[model samples]
Target: YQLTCYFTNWAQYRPGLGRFMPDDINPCLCTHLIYAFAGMQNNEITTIEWNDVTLYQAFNGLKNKNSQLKTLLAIGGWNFGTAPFTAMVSTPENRQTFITSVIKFLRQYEFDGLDFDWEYPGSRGSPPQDKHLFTVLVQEMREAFEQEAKQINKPRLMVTAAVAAGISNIQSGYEIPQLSQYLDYIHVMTYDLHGSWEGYTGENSPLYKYPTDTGSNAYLNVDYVMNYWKDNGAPAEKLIVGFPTYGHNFILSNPSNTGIGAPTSGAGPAGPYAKESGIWAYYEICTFLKNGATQGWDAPQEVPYAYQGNVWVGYDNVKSFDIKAQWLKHNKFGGAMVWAIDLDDFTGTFCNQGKFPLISTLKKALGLQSASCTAPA
Candidate 1:
């Protein structure tokens, strides 16, 4: 019964229709809201952004609007890599230093929990030994949280983690049974399964494996990744499947050959707001469709993609969200977690749909409680 959502801190810096601040959020739309990328220093939890305190005030402040909403402060992200995490968990003393600081930092920020986002524990230059050490870190943190709760006569702070969707990343980085034992929730990022980085186009988060998929390729879809986690050792009740609001864009090698796995030159043109080379926000895709791009649906994989001239992208839509949510329910998975709230069409104007259409659709499809009030026009 969890619908976790994340918001990137940098989204505040985006221009116009792309900008998102805590106040822009509809707090009731999500059961849990995680602020992305807090920092660590000298084996202690810290703030990376200069205005982190002010934003944390604003971020946690959204909770006042919805009492059921739980806020979390996340430390470590893709760019943050594994160096700090490896060092922090390298020794018992260092682990204690970081864990103590996390408790203080989370409590000071008025967060209900901490989202450990170490990217991947035993990869990206991290040693395989870190696989076990990471579990130690989480277990110790849980012990401290419980003891601290008793001492202060307060509820024990929740512990959750943003984990990998890649098969190799999962196999290499995690000690699943132990992690499930300590973490209250496990958010498996089921997106970015495919992207423009490769020579061919592939859906970012296909629900099922394509009929054409085989061997290692068959394991890339959301269906396999989620089950892999469950089958390995994580309980179905605590596994939160990821739903992305953005898509990966590609420049097709030939305009006439636009289809999944079609050859692509490189990343497609950047959208007006999210000027990242290979990615487009949902709003950006909305604009693309409006400008005459041809949208196609993959029945086998149960996803949608769009292409115009030699540019193509693989993304999800309302129908996919509905299907995915139903799948989650059928499989008895915990709930869905959107990668970042800001990437969705938060403004009602762009998609010609209401604000936060993707997320709201997910909430509705998952049977989560609806927002108390509709977004202002």
Candidate 2:
């Protein structure tokens, strides 16, 4: 699996210092490292800033201590501004300047590559016209990075991006077919398919089509997203499926279980559960599992579910992950990218029964050699 672990503005929460990090967090489990929200000008990338010393220490530990991983910086995020991005890529000079800054940033911190997480390109809250600019940005970045790699005589660094799952997002910001040529792979944000933002409560990420009475075509599911990309000319070999290690919780009224497909009164918590609904952090899920909430299973989707009283949390477990890996292998997908690793049961007791189960399971499925599995280094 092409497991990518996201490290969001570390200054906000220091996993190394054991602040909000999971009890047994281990960076070695991931094959790729992504620094979240690096492109936003107003965000922590400039405000709080990433401590080079701490970042280097953590990355060096992952490199020398765990030789199986590569790191990348992720730019843009959910709530990022679009003006800076527009200005940065509008002209060749600006694009070149941004590329120079990116290279300097990577060289300074020793990141392997960059992952552009631009939430979008042409449209934000309004209509967009300069959709082609998105492609231009990617092409320029690719050229700059390739030139640098050749100059240093090093292995070409990987270039990738996290894209919106909805067709609107794709049509608005990207010429995906053209953009794919410049990227090593594209991570489809298949999760958040349904959330509080919608009219009703639904799975955060569904693995299969939901049964309906009106003969309505199934809504967003793993199959739908994957097929959508492939049909749109995105090469399956360059597509990486995104899996969420966390879950989405919604408050329901009817005491009867809603199952995975049933509809609800609204999208988010009415009142009490609001803070925890919509999105639950990985560490938060770990805490819930540890507290005696057993995970439920959706056999059809090959996904997992859990509940605490009236609130329902839908997420992925080792079983779901195994199924996903099997699907990827059979379909010859590039690999699997788990949003964040810190959420899994590091202690193994809660999610993996006290072992690095997911990593081991993925390796077993892929038939890849894992140094940590046998004799210790």
Candidate 3:
């Protein structure tokens, strides 16, 4: 299986105890690494944070540690927002400018390619016209990359995008059939299906829907989202599914409302390490288990959650991760991706499962090695 993981740059500057830098990464764990993010201004690709170019060098430099790894510069993220992207792809000239600028950036930073993470193309504060403009941008980039690769006699640059997993997002932001034609792969962001944003507590990444789940939870699941994309023109072999190394946190309206599908009055308290009120990294989730939080399982959804008092969290543990990996292998899915590395107990202190244990478990489940990928025959 193709294993890819996103390495967020801002994690390096997290409040106090939560900083993660490039050197903390273990490139040997995955086939590819995505450095997020590069931005855009005046229709040309740019950097979002200070010392971006310097950091880009250091981030891509991880290949020196693991020669087998390939790195890509992921452009745009949730924090980067959607307005600038909508404008960039609004016209053909703008698309061409973007294509040219991306090539220059990729070559300069020594990245294998670029990942388009528009967050998203037509919705979440984007104009309605972005539905088709998104497709046009990808098409132009692919054509330009093809010509540029021929001219320089280098490998054709990979063109991929981190796309929404929701059914509505699939329709609103993408012309799937056409988009797939131009992309090397589609990183299906299958996580974030549910979180504190809802009035109730829900899974961060459920493999299947529970009978008790109603509304969006009923139809929104990793299984359903992947199947939806495949059935609606996203090629199964070209779709890489995402796994969340975190959980959705919530404070129950009543202390007794402590089970899955319970109502939440608001977000739970932030973790000392993660510092995110509504979320907890897998690393921090393990701390709860260590401190006597009882873990529970949702059989239908094929995932586990933990709770004590009014604090309830639904997250992926080793058991759930293995099941999802096996599903990917059985379904002939292209690969698996993770939202982040820093959030997963990279230092090996908390979980007793060892450093990057979840990532290691994922690689083992995928039948991959530190040096090679040899799926069980």
Candidate 4:
């Protein structure tokens, strides 16, 4: 089992208490620490931030404290879009060049693995051919990793991907069987099932479907997404469930109509910490609760939300994290994965709990003492 924690490059730019650095992370907390996003430049893997080189030194240095920790570098995000990937994977020469650069960059940075986070291959105006080409890319990369290991007499680099949880996106973008065969882990993005993008208010990552949820709506929860991936050729042990540290916020149309499906005008005001209108970091939610926001639990959906005036926030807490961790263990899933650890109460000042309260709850509930990573004999 693993507790995969993600830390973003942009988190360092956040003002004051929200500012996060590699030094703030608990080396013992996560089995794998994934750095979110190294982009493509001229079809080669490139770093987006100016200080990423120095940051990588600090990030990988965590392994010194916990020898079992595995560090991975992710490439792509929602903002990165699909065009760069579509162009890179379109030709054999282009694919080979990218793959060669990936291995070299990973080795130079001391990353133990590489994570492919293509938003989607066939969707977002990308051609359908990319769906098949994706499998070819992974297959080629796996081969190259093994070949490189044989030549250098070292362990092969671990391969993984951050994948879509929605059934439509899963079917259109992934070939689960081939993916399962080559990948060491398949991180299923089970959060963001619902958000301010929709017309009504809803939980960001409900454990189960609500009573009124029908047809396709039934497929939009953690339970449905995990089972769908398992049933569709992904091995249970290879599937990593995603847990978000932030929640969706919406400006309710009627203050009195504060419920799960209440009408919403738009996103709530930007959170002081997250600085995003549609979302609130867990730490920001802590302050909101302290300011007398009435927190309510949705028993039917098995998640919690809070509302005060027209601002309604749907988010996860320690209680929800514990429940989800138990569910993950019962289902025999690979492990729990967090979107970004920086969104949690890293300093322990706001939540009044210890640092990384949410992730710590998960680590305890999942019974992960230390990572199982071992060097090749």
Q: State which candidate has the highest lDDT.
A: 4
**In what order do the candidates fall by lDDT, top score first?**
4, 1, 3, 2
List where candidate 4 sits over 4 angstroms from the true fold: 370-377
Per-model TM-score, in order, reads 0.97, 0.84, 0.95, 0.97
Of candidates 4 and 2, the better by TM-score: 4
Worst 10 residues of 2 by lDDT: 16-25
Candidate 4 lDDT (Cα, whole model)? 0.91
**Model 4 TM-score?**
0.97
Task: Report backbone clashes per prediction.
Answer: 0, 4, 0, 0
Where does the lowest 10-residue lDDT sum fall in candidate 1? 368-377
Candidate 4 C-alpha lDDT tens digits along 1-377: 78999999999999999999998898889999999889999889999999999999999988877877889999999999999999999999999999999999999999998999999988987789888899999989999999999999988898899999888898899888887899889999989898888878999999999997999999989999999999999999999999999999999999999999999999888998779889999999999999999999988778899999999999899999889888999999999899889999989999988899999999888877544534333
Query: Model 1 over residues 1-377: C-alpha lDDT tens digits?
Result: 68889988898888987888888888888889999979888999888878889999998988777766789988999899999999999999999999899888888889998999987888999999999999999999999999999999998899999999988899899999888999999999999999877789999999999887888999999989999999999999999999999999999999999888899989989988878898998889999999999989989989999999888989998889889999999999999899879998888788877888899888888877554533323
lDDT of 3 at 124: 92
Tens-digit lDDT track of model 2 for 1-377: 46666665542353332233222335556667676646545222321244644654465356655556678877777766566677666677777777777777777777788888776776774237447877787888888888989999987777898887776677687787898899888988888876655444466667776664123236477777777887887889888888776677666555366576545554433222113446665445665667776677767667776666666667666677778788778877787776665444444544535555655566567655453522125
| Higher-ranked by lDDT: 2 or 3 | 3
Error of 4 at 251 (Å): 0.4
Computed on alpha carbons, the lDDT of every model, listed in order, comes to 0.90, 0.65, 0.86, 0.91
